[PDB]
Amino acid sequence: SMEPRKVVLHKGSTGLGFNIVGGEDGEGIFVSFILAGGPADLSGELQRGDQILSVNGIDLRGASHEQAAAALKGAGQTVTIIAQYQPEDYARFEAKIHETSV
């Protein structure tokens, strides 16, 4: 896999400009969506399938969705993220089956 790297964003009128998923069913925290024109987009330094490993020194390896949301939303505007591209893990995540007709 690609090595983790540091990404620094400055929140604005729509926050950091991305969505997270995961932190449930034993899964990591993933970037699911990047808002066109938002800070994440304009930076060019985050993409869908990045795993969020830490936020302002808060370790989100193994974090719940709630813990990750609290770290990201509770942060002030300058957010220092350690992210790692995890395309295969994310692809699996997105294909998981949640409802089955029997």
Side-chain angles (χ1 to χ4, degrees), residues 64-98:
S64 63
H65 194 92
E66 298 93 340
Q67 286 168 341
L72 285 155
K73 292 172 67 174
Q77 290 177 245
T78 302
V79 188
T80 301
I81 298 165
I82 301 303
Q84 184 177 28
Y85 189 40
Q86 291 283 276
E88 296 180 14
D89 204 31
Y90 183 59
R92 184 191 46 72
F93 180 82
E94 282 308 316
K96 293 165 65 174
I97 296 155
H98 301 288

PDB file of all heavy atoms in Angstrom, residues 64-98:
ATOM      1  N   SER A  64     -14.432   4.343  16.371  1.00  0.00           N
ATOM      2  CA  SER A  64     -15.814   4.243  15.943  1.00  0.00           C
ATOM      3  C   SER A  64     -16.163   5.444  15.048  1.00  0.00           C
ATOM      4  O   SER A  64     -15.493   6.487  15.072  1.00  0.00           O
ATOM      5  CB  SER A  64     -16.777   4.272  17.135  1.00  0.00           C
ATOM      6  OG  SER A  64     -16.683   5.498  17.823  1.00  0.00           O
ATOM      7  N   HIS A  65     -17.250   5.302  14.299  1.00  0.00           N
ATOM      8  CA  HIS A  65     -17.757   6.400  13.499  1.00  0.00           C
ATOM      9  C   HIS A  65     -17.929   7.644  14.380  1.00  0.00           C
ATOM     10  O   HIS A  65     -17.560   8.767  13.973  1.00  0.00           O
ATOM     11  CB  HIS A  65     -19.086   6.025  12.839  1.00  0.00           C
ATOM     12  CG  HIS A  65     -19.492   6.980  11.761  1.00  0.00           C
ATOM     13  ND1 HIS A  65     -19.159   6.791  10.437  1.00  0.00           N
ATOM     14  CD2 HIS A  65     -20.152   8.163  11.819  1.00  0.00           C
ATOM     15  CE1 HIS A  65     -19.599   7.818   9.727  1.00  0.00           C
ATOM     16  NE2 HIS A  65     -20.222   8.654  10.536  1.00  0.00           N
ATOM     17  N   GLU A  66     -18.485   7.449  15.583  1.00  0.00           N
ATOM     18  CA  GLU A  66     -18.745   8.567  16.489  1.00  0.00           C
ATOM     19  C   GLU A  66     -17.469   9.259  16.932  1.00  0.00           C
ATOM     20  O   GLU A  66     -17.394  10.496  16.955  1.00  0.00           O
ATOM     21  CB  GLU A  66     -19.552   8.110  17.698  1.00  0.00           C
ATOM     22  CG  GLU A  66     -20.930   7.563  17.317  1.00  0.00           C
ATOM     23  CD  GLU A  66     -20.980   6.058  17.102  1.00  0.00           C
ATOM     24  OE1 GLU A  66     -19.914   5.438  16.877  1.00  0.00           O
ATOM     25  OE2 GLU A  66     -22.107   5.496  17.150  1.00  0.00           O
ATOM     26  N   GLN A  67     -16.454   8.472  17.242  1.00  0.00           N
ATOM     27  CA  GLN A  67     -15.174   9.033  17.668  1.00  0.00           C
ATOM     28  C   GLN A  67     -14.523   9.829  16.527  1.00  0.00           C
ATOM     29  O   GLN A  67     -13.951  10.890  16.756  1.00  0.00           O
ATOM     30  CB  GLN A  67     -14.246   7.924  18.143  1.00  0.00           C
ATOM     31  CG  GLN A  67     -14.621   7.370  19.507  1.00  0.00           C
ATOM     32  CD  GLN A  67     -13.901   6.080  19.873  1.00  0.00           C
ATOM     33  OE1 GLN A  67     -13.359   5.366  19.017  1.00  0.00           O
ATOM     34  NE2 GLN A  67     -13.933   5.746  21.171  1.00  0.00           N
ATOM     35  N   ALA A  68     -14.627   9.321  15.298  1.00  0.00           N
ATOM     36  CA  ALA A  68     -14.031   9.996  14.154  1.00  0.00           C
ATOM     37  C   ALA A  68     -14.797  11.295  13.867  1.00  0.00           C
ATOM     38  O   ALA A  68     -14.185  12.332  13.595  1.00  0.00           O
ATOM     39  CB  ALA A  68     -14.026   9.079  12.918  1.00  0.00           C
ATOM     40  N   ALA A  69     -16.133  11.222  13.882  1.00  0.00           N
ATOM     41  CA  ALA A  69     -16.966  12.408  13.648  1.00  0.00           C
ATOM     42  C   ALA A  69     -16.679  13.462  14.712  1.00  0.00           C
ATOM     43  O   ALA A  69     -16.561  14.651  14.390  1.00  0.00           O
ATOM     44  CB  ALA A  69     -18.441  12.052  13.593  1.00  0.00           C
ATOM     45  N   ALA A  70     -16.544  13.034  15.973  1.00  0.00           N
ATOM     46  CA  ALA A  70     -16.261  13.979  17.059  1.00  0.00           C
ATOM     47  C   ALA A  70     -14.887  14.652  16.889  1.00  0.00           C
ATOM     48  O   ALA A  70     -14.747  15.851  17.156  1.00  0.00           O
ATOM     49  CB  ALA A  70     -16.354  13.290  18.431  1.00  0.00           C
ATOM     50  N   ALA A  71     -13.879  13.887  16.475  1.00  0.00           N
ATOM     51  CA  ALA A  71     -12.528  14.431  16.251  1.00  0.00           C
ATOM     52  C   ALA A  71     -12.548  15.461  15.107  1.00  0.00           C
ATOM     53  O   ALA A  71     -12.034  16.578  15.235  1.00  0.00           O
ATOM     54  CB  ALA A  71     -11.516  13.328  15.958  1.00  0.00           C
ATOM     55  N   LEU A  72     -13.173  15.085  14.001  1.00  0.00           N
ATOM     56  CA  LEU A  72     -13.208  15.943  12.812  1.00  0.00           C
ATOM     57  C   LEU A  72     -14.064  17.196  13.026  1.00  0.00           C
ATOM     58  O   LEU A  72     -13.665  18.295  12.638  1.00  0.00           O
ATOM     59  CB  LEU A  72     -13.688  15.146  11.599  1.00  0.00           C
ATOM     60  CG  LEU A  72     -12.618  14.181  11.040  1.00  0.00           C
ATOM     61  CD1 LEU A  72     -13.242  12.991  10.276  1.00  0.00           C
ATOM     62  CD2 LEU A  72     -11.577  14.912  10.140  1.00  0.00           C
ATOM     63  N   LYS A  73     -15.253  17.032  13.601  1.00  0.00           N
ATOM     64  CA  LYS A  73     -16.192  18.153  13.762  1.00  0.00           C
ATOM     65  C   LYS A  73     -15.835  19.030  14.941  1.00  0.00           C
ATOM     66  O   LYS A  73     -16.040  20.242  14.898  1.00  0.00           O
ATOM     67  CB  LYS A  73     -17.644  17.657  13.817  1.00  0.00           C
ATOM     68  CG  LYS A  73     -18.127  17.076  12.478  1.00  0.00           C
ATOM     69  CD  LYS A  73     -19.501  16.391  12.525  1.00  0.00           C
ATOM     70  CE  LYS A  73     -20.631  17.327  12.796  1.00  0.00           C
ATOM     71  NZ  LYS A  73     -21.934  16.597  12.673  1.00  0.00           N
ATOM     72  N   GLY A  74     -15.298  18.419  15.992  1.00  0.00           N
ATOM     73  CA  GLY A  74     -14.860  19.145  17.163  1.00  0.00           C
ATOM     74  C   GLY A  74     -13.606  19.975  16.964  1.00  0.00           C
ATOM     75  O   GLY A  74     -13.373  20.950  17.703  1.00  0.00           O
ATOM     76  N   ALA A  75     -12.802  19.601  15.973  1.00  0.00           N
ATOM     77  CA  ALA A  75     -11.580  20.323  15.646  1.00  0.00           C
ATOM     78  C   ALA A  75     -11.921  21.759  15.249  1.00  0.00           C
ATOM     79  O   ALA A  75     -12.995  22.027  14.694  1.00  0.00           O
ATOM     80  CB  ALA A  75     -10.813  19.626  14.507  1.00  0.00           C
ATOM     81  N   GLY A  76     -11.015  22.684  15.545  1.00  0.00           N
ATOM     82  CA  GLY A  76     -11.090  24.029  14.981  1.00  0.00           C
ATOM     83  C   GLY A  76     -10.744  23.989  13.500  1.00  0.00           C
ATOM     84  O   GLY A  76     -10.629  22.920  12.912  1.00  0.00           O
ATOM     85  N   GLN A  77     -10.555  25.145  12.880  1.00  0.00           N
ATOM     86  CA  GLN A  77     -10.577  25.156  11.425  1.00  0.00           C
ATOM     87  C   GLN A  77      -9.380  24.458  10.800  1.00  0.00           C
ATOM     88  O   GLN A  77      -9.542  23.828   9.751  1.00  0.00           O
ATOM     89  CB  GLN A  77     -10.721  26.573  10.872  1.00  0.00           C
ATOM     90  CG  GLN A  77     -12.088  27.198  11.105  1.00  0.00           C
ATOM     91  CD  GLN A  77     -12.144  28.627  10.606  1.00  0.00           C
ATOM     92  OE1 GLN A  77     -12.298  29.554  11.400  1.00  0.00           O
ATOM     93  NE2 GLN A  77     -11.988  28.818   9.286  1.00  0.00           N
ATOM     94  N   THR A  78      -8.194  24.582  11.400  1.00  0.00           N
ATOM     95  CA  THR A  78      -7.002  23.934  10.834  1.00  0.00           C
ATOM     96  C   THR A  78      -6.962  22.498  11.329  1.00  0.00           C
ATOM     97  O   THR A  78      -6.835  22.257  12.528  1.00  0.00           O
ATOM     98  CB  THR A  78      -5.697  24.662  11.183  1.00  0.00           C
ATOM     99  OG1 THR A  78      -5.760  26.026  10.726  1.00  0.00           O
ATOM    100  CG2 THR A  78      -4.479  23.928  10.543  1.00  0.00           C
ATOM    101  N   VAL A  79      -7.111  21.550  10.405  1.00  0.00           N
ATOM    102  CA  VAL A  79      -7.149  20.140  10.742  1.00  0.00           C
ATOM    103  C   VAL A  79      -5.990  19.407  10.068  1.00  0.00           C
ATOM    104  O   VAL A  79      -5.877  19.404   8.834  1.00  0.00           O
ATOM    105  CB  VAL A  79      -8.506  19.508  10.350  1.00  0.00           C
ATOM    106  CG1 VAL A  79      -8.620  18.081  10.873  1.00  0.00           C
ATOM    107  CG2 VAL A  79      -9.662  20.367  10.917  1.00  0.00           C
ATOM    108  N   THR A  80      -5.159  18.784  10.900  1.00  0.00           N
ATOM    109  CA  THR A  80      -3.994  18.036  10.460  1.00  0.00           C
ATOM    110  C   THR A  80      -4.345  16.551  10.464  1.00  0.00           C
ATOM    111  O   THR A  80      -4.547  15.960  11.521  1.00  0.00           O
ATOM    112  CB  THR A  80      -2.816  18.326  11.373  1.00  0.00           C
ATOM    113  OG1 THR A  80      -2.545  19.734  11.341  1.00  0.00           O
ATOM    114  CG2 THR A  80      -1.578  17.574  10.918  1.00  0.00           C
ATOM    115  N   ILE A  81      -4.427  15.976   9.263  1.00  0.00           N
ATOM    116  CA  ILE A  81      -4.897  14.605   9.050  1.00  0.00           C
ATOM    117  C   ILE A  81      -3.722  13.746   8.603  1.00  0.00           C
ATOM    118  O   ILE A  81      -2.921  14.182   7.787  1.00  0.00           O
ATOM    119  CB  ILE A  81      -5.978  14.589   7.949  1.00  0.00           C
ATOM    120  CG1 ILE A  81      -7.197  15.428   8.377  1.00  0.00           C
ATOM    121  CG2 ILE A  81      -6.338  13.145   7.537  1.00  0.00           C
ATOM    122  CD1 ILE A  81      -8.154  15.777   7.244  1.00  0.00           C
ATOM    123  N   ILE A  82      -3.618  12.541   9.149  1.00  0.00           N
ATOM    124  CA  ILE A  82      -2.767  11.495   8.574  1.00  0.00           C
ATOM    125  C   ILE A  82      -3.732  10.557   7.867  1.00  0.00           C
ATOM    126  O   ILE A  82      -4.655  10.022   8.490  1.00  0.00           O
ATOM    127  CB  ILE A  82      -1.939  10.711   9.604  1.00  0.00           C
ATOM    128  CG1 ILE A  82      -1.010  11.652  10.385  1.00  0.00           C
ATOM    129  CG2 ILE A  82      -1.169   9.566   8.891  1.00  0.00           C
ATOM    130  CD1 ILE A  82      -0.049  12.482   9.548  1.00  0.00           C
ATOM    131  N   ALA A  83      -3.565  10.476   6.546  1.00  0.00           N
ATOM    132  CA  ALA A  83      -4.400   9.662   5.671  1.00  0.00           C
ATOM    133  C   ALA A  83      -3.566   8.619   4.934  1.00  0.00           C
ATOM    134  O   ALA A  83      -2.370   8.806   4.708  1.00  0.00           O
ATOM    135  CB  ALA A  83      -5.144  10.554   4.667  1.00  0.00           C
ATOM    136  N   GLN A  84      -4.186   7.495   4.611  1.00  0.00           N
ATOM    137  CA  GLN A  84      -3.514   6.434   3.848  1.00  0.00           C
ATOM    138  C   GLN A  84      -4.474   5.840   2.848  1.00  0.00           C
ATOM    139  O   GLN A  84      -5.571   5.399   3.207  1.00  0.00           O
ATOM    140  CB  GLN A  84      -3.005   5.332   4.762  1.00  0.00           C
ATOM    141  CG  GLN A  84      -2.210   4.250   4.014  1.00  0.00           C
ATOM    142  CD  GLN A  84      -1.633   3.178   4.913  1.00  0.00           C
ATOM    143  OE1 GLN A  84      -2.172   2.891   5.981  1.00  0.00           O
ATOM    144  NE2 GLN A  84      -0.559   2.533   4.452  1.00  0.00           N
ATOM    145  N   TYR A  85      -4.077   5.868   1.583  1.00  0.00           N
ATOM    146  CA  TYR A  85      -4.914   5.362   0.507  1.00  0.00           C
ATOM    147  C   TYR A  85      -5.081   3.842   0.674  1.00  0.00           C
ATOM    148  O   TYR A  85      -4.091   3.105   0.742  1.00  0.00           O
ATOM    149  CB  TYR A  85      -4.293   5.731  -0.847  1.00  0.00           C
ATOM    150  CG  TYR A  85      -5.171   5.453  -2.036  1.00  0.00           C
ATOM    151  CD1 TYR A  85      -6.542   5.704  -1.998  1.00  0.00           C
ATOM    152  CD2 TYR A  85      -4.635   4.911  -3.202  1.00  0.00           C
ATOM    153  CE1 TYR A  85      -7.354   5.420  -3.103  1.00  0.00           C
ATOM    154  CE2 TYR A  85      -5.440   4.623  -4.301  1.00  0.00           C
ATOM    155  CZ  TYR A  85      -6.789   4.882  -4.243  1.00  0.00           C
ATOM    156  OH  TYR A  85      -7.582   4.602  -5.336  1.00  0.00           O
ATOM    157  N   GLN A  86      -6.338   3.389   0.763  1.00  0.00           N
ATOM    158  CA  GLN A  86      -6.656   1.978   1.006  1.00  0.00           C
ATOM    159  C   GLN A  86      -7.751   1.521   0.028  1.00  0.00           C
ATOM    160  O   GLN A  86      -8.896   1.227   0.418  1.00  0.00           O
ATOM    161  CB  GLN A  86      -7.083   1.769   2.463  1.00  0.00           C
ATOM    162  CG  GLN A  86      -5.956   1.963   3.451  1.00  0.00           C
ATOM    163  CD  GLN A  86      -5.005   0.787   3.510  1.00  0.00           C
ATOM    164  OE1 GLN A  86      -5.261  -0.197   4.222  1.00  0.00           O
ATOM    165  NE2 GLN A  86      -3.888   0.879   2.778  1.00  0.00           N
ATOM    166  N   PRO A  87      -7.412   1.513  -1.267  1.00  0.00           N
ATOM    167  CA  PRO A  87      -8.412   1.316  -2.306  1.00  0.00           C
ATOM    168  C   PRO A  87      -9.099  -0.042  -2.293  1.00  0.00           C
ATOM    169  O   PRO A  87     -10.309  -0.120  -2.591  1.00  0.00           O
ATOM    170  CB  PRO A  87      -7.601   1.490  -3.590  1.00  0.00           C
ATOM    171  CG  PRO A  87      -6.199   1.181  -3.220  1.00  0.00           C
ATOM    172  CD  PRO A  87      -6.066   1.733  -1.838  1.00  0.00           C
ATOM    173  N   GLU A  88      -8.353  -1.094  -1.958  1.00  0.00           N
ATOM    174  CA  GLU A  88      -8.909  -2.446  -1.968  1.00  0.00           C
ATOM    175  C   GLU A  88      -9.842  -2.632  -0.766  1.00  0.00           C
ATOM    176  O   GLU A  88     -10.915  -3.213  -0.887  1.00  0.00           O
ATOM    177  CB  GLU A  88      -7.808  -3.511  -1.919  1.00  0.00           C
ATOM    178  CG  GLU A  88      -6.865  -3.539  -3.128  1.00  0.00           C
ATOM    179  CD  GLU A  88      -5.786  -4.629  -3.023  1.00  0.00           C
ATOM    180  OE1 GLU A  88      -5.907  -5.544  -2.168  1.00  0.00           O
ATOM    181  OE2 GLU A  88      -4.806  -4.565  -3.792  1.00  0.00           O
ATOM    182  N   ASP A  89      -9.429  -2.137   0.397  1.00  0.00           N
ATOM    183  CA  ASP A  89     -10.253  -2.251   1.602  1.00  0.00           C
ATOM    184  C   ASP A  89     -11.532  -1.439   1.384  1.00  0.00           C
ATOM    185  O   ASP A  89     -12.634  -1.893   1.734  1.00  0.00           O
ATOM    186  CB  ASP A  89      -9.446  -1.764   2.816  1.00  0.00           C
ATOM    187  CG  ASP A  89      -9.930  -2.337   4.142  1.00  0.00           C
ATOM    188  OD1 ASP A  89     -10.448  -3.483   4.199  1.00  0.00           O
ATOM    189  OD2 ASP A  89      -9.742  -1.634   5.162  1.00  0.00           O
ATOM    190  N   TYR A  90     -11.394  -0.239   0.814  1.00  0.00           N
ATOM    191  CA  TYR A  90     -12.571   0.600   0.598  1.00  0.00           C
ATOM    192  C   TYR A  90     -13.518  -0.041  -0.436  1.00  0.00           C
ATOM    193  O   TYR A  90     -14.730  -0.034  -0.244  1.00  0.00           O
ATOM    194  CB  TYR A  90     -12.183   2.019   0.161  1.00  0.00           C
ATOM    195  CG  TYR A  90     -13.370   2.917   0.013  1.00  0.00           C
ATOM    196  CD1 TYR A  90     -14.207   3.156   1.092  1.00  0.00           C
ATOM    197  CD2 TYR A  90     -13.685   3.504  -1.206  1.00  0.00           C
ATOM    198  CE1 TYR A  90     -15.313   3.970   0.972  1.00  0.00           C
ATOM    199  CE2 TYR A  90     -14.816   4.343  -1.333  1.00  0.00           C
ATOM    200  CZ  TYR A  90     -15.631   4.543  -0.252  1.00  0.00           C
ATOM    201  OH  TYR A  90     -16.748   5.351  -0.364  1.00  0.00           O
ATOM    202  N   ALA A  91     -12.960  -0.596  -1.519  1.00  0.00           N
ATOM    203  CA  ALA A  91     -13.771  -1.264  -2.543  1.00  0.00           C
ATOM    204  C   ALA A  91     -14.593  -2.385  -1.913  1.00  0.00           C
ATOM    205  O   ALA A  91     -15.774  -2.562  -2.228  1.00  0.00           O
ATOM    206  CB  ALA A  91     -12.892  -1.809  -3.639  1.00  0.00           C
ATOM    207  N   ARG A  92     -13.967  -3.151  -1.024  1.00  0.00           N
ATOM    208  CA  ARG A  92     -14.684  -4.213  -0.333  1.00  0.00           C
ATOM    209  C   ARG A  92     -15.794  -3.642   0.527  1.00  0.00           C
ATOM    210  O   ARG A  92     -16.945  -4.087   0.443  1.00  0.00           O
ATOM    211  CB  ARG A  92     -13.745  -5.057   0.516  1.00  0.00           C
ATOM    212  CG  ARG A  92     -14.453  -6.245   1.168  1.00  0.00           C
ATOM    213  CD  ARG A  92     -13.592  -6.934   2.204  1.00  0.00           C
ATOM    214  NE  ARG A  92     -12.986  -5.925   3.058  1.00  0.00           N
ATOM    215  CZ  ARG A  92     -13.636  -5.196   3.970  1.00  0.00           C
ATOM    216  NH1 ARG A  92     -14.920  -5.368   4.203  1.00  0.00           N
ATOM    217  NH2 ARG A  92     -12.980  -4.278   4.648  1.00  0.00           N
ATOM    218  N   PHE A  93     -15.458  -2.625   1.316  1.00  0.00           N
ATOM    219  CA  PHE A  93     -16.441  -1.923   2.141  1.00  0.00           C
ATOM    220  C   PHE A  93     -17.684  -1.511   1.344  1.00  0.00           C
ATOM    221  O   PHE A  93     -18.820  -1.731   1.781  1.00  0.00           O
ATOM    222  CB  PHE A  93     -15.802  -0.675   2.771  1.00  0.00           C
ATOM    223  CG  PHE A  93     -16.737   0.108   3.625  1.00  0.00           C
ATOM    224  CD1 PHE A  93     -16.983  -0.264   4.922  1.00  0.00           C
ATOM    225  CD2 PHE A  93     -17.399   1.216   3.127  1.00  0.00           C
ATOM    226  CE1 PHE A  93     -17.859   0.443   5.717  1.00  0.00           C
ATOM    227  CE2 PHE A  93     -18.290   1.934   3.929  1.00  0.00           C
ATOM    228  CZ  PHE A  93     -18.507   1.548   5.226  1.00  0.00           C
ATOM    229  N   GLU A  94     -17.464  -0.917   0.179  1.00  0.00           N
ATOM    230  CA  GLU A  94     -18.581  -0.377  -0.588  1.00  0.00           C
ATOM    231  C   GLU A  94     -19.480  -1.454  -1.185  1.00  0.00           C
ATOM    232  O   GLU A  94     -20.666  -1.192  -1.407  1.00  0.00           O
ATOM    233  CB  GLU A  94     -18.091   0.596  -1.667  1.00  0.00           C
ATOM    234  CG  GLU A  94     -17.731   1.963  -1.113  1.00  0.00           C
ATOM    235  CD  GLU A  94     -18.848   2.555  -0.279  1.00  0.00           C
ATOM    236  OE1 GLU A  94     -20.018   2.475  -0.700  1.00  0.00           O
ATOM    237  OE2 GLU A  94     -18.562   3.094   0.809  1.00  0.00           O
ATOM    238  N   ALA A  95     -18.931  -2.657  -1.392  1.00  0.00           N
ATOM    239  CA  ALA A  95     -19.670  -3.798  -1.941  1.00  0.00           C
ATOM    240  C   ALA A  95     -20.385  -4.674  -0.912  1.00  0.00           C
ATOM    241  O   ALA A  95     -21.046  -5.635  -1.279  1.00  0.00           O
ATOM    242  CB  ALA A  95     -18.744  -4.667  -2.766  1.00  0.00           C
ATOM    243  N   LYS A  96     -20.240  -4.367   0.369  1.00  0.00           N
ATOM    244  CA  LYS A  96     -20.823  -5.211   1.410  1.00  0.00           C
ATOM    245  C   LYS A  96     -22.342  -5.265   1.301  1.00  0.00           C
ATOM    246  O   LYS A  96     -22.982  -4.322   0.867  1.00  0.00           O
ATOM    247  CB  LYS A  96     -20.426  -4.722   2.802  1.00  0.00           C
ATOM    248  CG  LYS A  96     -18.961  -4.885   3.094  1.00  0.00           C
ATOM    249  CD  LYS A  96     -18.531  -4.089   4.309  1.00  0.00           C
ATOM    250  CE  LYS A  96     -19.166  -4.591   5.557  1.00  0.00           C
ATOM    251  NZ  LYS A  96     -18.669  -3.917   6.796  1.00  0.00           N
ATOM    252  N   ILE A  97     -22.903  -6.391   1.716  1.00  0.00           N
ATOM    253  CA  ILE A  97     -24.337  -6.603   1.629  1.00  0.00           C
ATOM    254  C   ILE A  97     -24.939  -6.319   2.991  1.00  0.00           C
ATOM    255  O   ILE A  97     -24.533  -6.925   3.989  1.00  0.00           O
ATOM    256  CB  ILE A  97     -24.652  -8.047   1.197  1.00  0.00           C
ATOM    257  CG1 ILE A  97     -24.114  -8.292  -0.223  1.00  0.00           C
ATOM    258  CG2 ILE A  97     -26.178  -8.304   1.248  1.00  0.00           C
ATOM    259  CD1 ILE A  97     -23.813  -9.742  -0.524  1.00  0.00           C
ATOM    260  N   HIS A  98     -25.918  -5.416   3.016  1.00  0.00           N
ATOM    261  CA  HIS A  98     -26.595  -4.992   4.248  1.00  0.00           C
ATOM    262  C   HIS A  98     -28.025  -5.514   4.405  1.00  0.00           C
ATOM    263  O   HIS A  98     -28.539  -5.586   5.517  1.00  0.00           O
ATOM    264  CB  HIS A  98     -26.583  -3.472   4.305  1.00  0.00           C
ATOM    265  CG  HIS A  98     -25.202  -2.899   4.287  1.00  0.00           C
ATOM    266  ND1 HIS A  98     -24.351  -2.989   5.365  1.00  0.00           N
ATOM    267  CD2 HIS A  98     -24.515  -2.262   3.315  1.00  0.00           C
ATOM    268  CE1 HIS A  98     -23.192  -2.432   5.056  1.00  0.00           C
ATOM    269  NE2 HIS A  98     -23.268  -1.977   3.817  1.00  0.00           N
TER     270      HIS A  98
END
